[PDB]
């Protein structure tokens, strides 16, 4: 936390790369039911507990 | 028709800011000069000048002067003209004493 170990920074990289909405072209696919990103994590709303 | 007559006044803000909270005297001095010019000129839009906003506030919220000279002009609005085509524009005129000055129509020529 401002001075870190590599394990924590690697989990931040994974939590940053997941922090996006749907790709829009999945909304069109044959047999779709995916309507939004259900596993969205903000940093105000839900702490990650590392 | 034209009605672009510009007049001077002595507004007596002592008897308009009486009994009013000290952190609300100069805001009401502004909102009372607007009502004064709406009374005289008759138009609804009043524009103050920022030099007058300095001369109201020379002395904090609570040190509004008793009498201010005013030059009020009444001018017309254009270029997407307002709800009313005429508006007032209130300026100060510099004087060492606002004591003893009758109202005066200003000659602008």
């Amino acid at each position: 936390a401002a001075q870190k170990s590599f394990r924590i920074k690697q989990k931040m990289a994974k939590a940053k790369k997941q922090n996006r909405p749907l790709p829009q072209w999945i909304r069109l696919r044959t047999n779709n039911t995916i309507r939004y990103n259900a596993k969205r994590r903000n940093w105000r709303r839900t702490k990650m507990n590392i | 028709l034209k009605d672009v007559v510009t007049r001077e006044y002595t507004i007596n803000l002592h008897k308009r800011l009486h009994g009013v909270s000290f952190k609300k005297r100069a805001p009401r001095a502004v909102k009372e000069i607007k009502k004064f010019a709406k009374l005289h000129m008759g138009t609804d839009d009043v524009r103050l000048a920022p030099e007058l906003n300095q001369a109201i506030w020379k002395r904090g919220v609570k040190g509004v002067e008793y009498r201010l000279r005013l030059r009020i002009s009444r001018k017309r609005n254009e270029e997407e003209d307002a709800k009313n085509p005429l508006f007032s524009y209130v300026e100060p005129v510099l004087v060492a004493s606002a004591k003893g000055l009758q109202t005066v129509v200003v000659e602008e020529d």
Binding site: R7, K11, N49, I50 | -
Partner: protein, 87 residues
């Protein structure tokens, strides 16, 4: 003084990320994990926690090698290659 202003002083971690099970259940001062049990030689499971044996058992992960066993049994554990027949 025991409610919210005592939750004020609360900035440390008893637990950090387990290396075996990756859960943040690994107690720092104890040097042991509470979910799996690392660094024990085992992986703690208790029959009173039958839901723990639902969360952490076989089938819940990838089965990176067991997945190819029953298939590999069905052929009788063949070794070698295959011949070519037609087209």
């Amino acid at each position: 003084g025991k409610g919210t202003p005592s939750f004020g002083k609360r900035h440390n971690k008893s637990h950090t990320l387990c290396n075996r099970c990756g859960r943040r259940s690994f107690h720092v001062q104890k040097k042991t994990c509470s979910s799996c049990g690392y660094p024990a030689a085992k992986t703690r499971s208790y029959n009173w926690g039958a839901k723990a044996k639902r969360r952490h058992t076989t089938g819940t992960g990838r089965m990176r090698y067991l997945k190819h066993v029953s298939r590999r049994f069905k052929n009788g554990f063949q070794t070698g290659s295959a011949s070519k027949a037609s087209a």
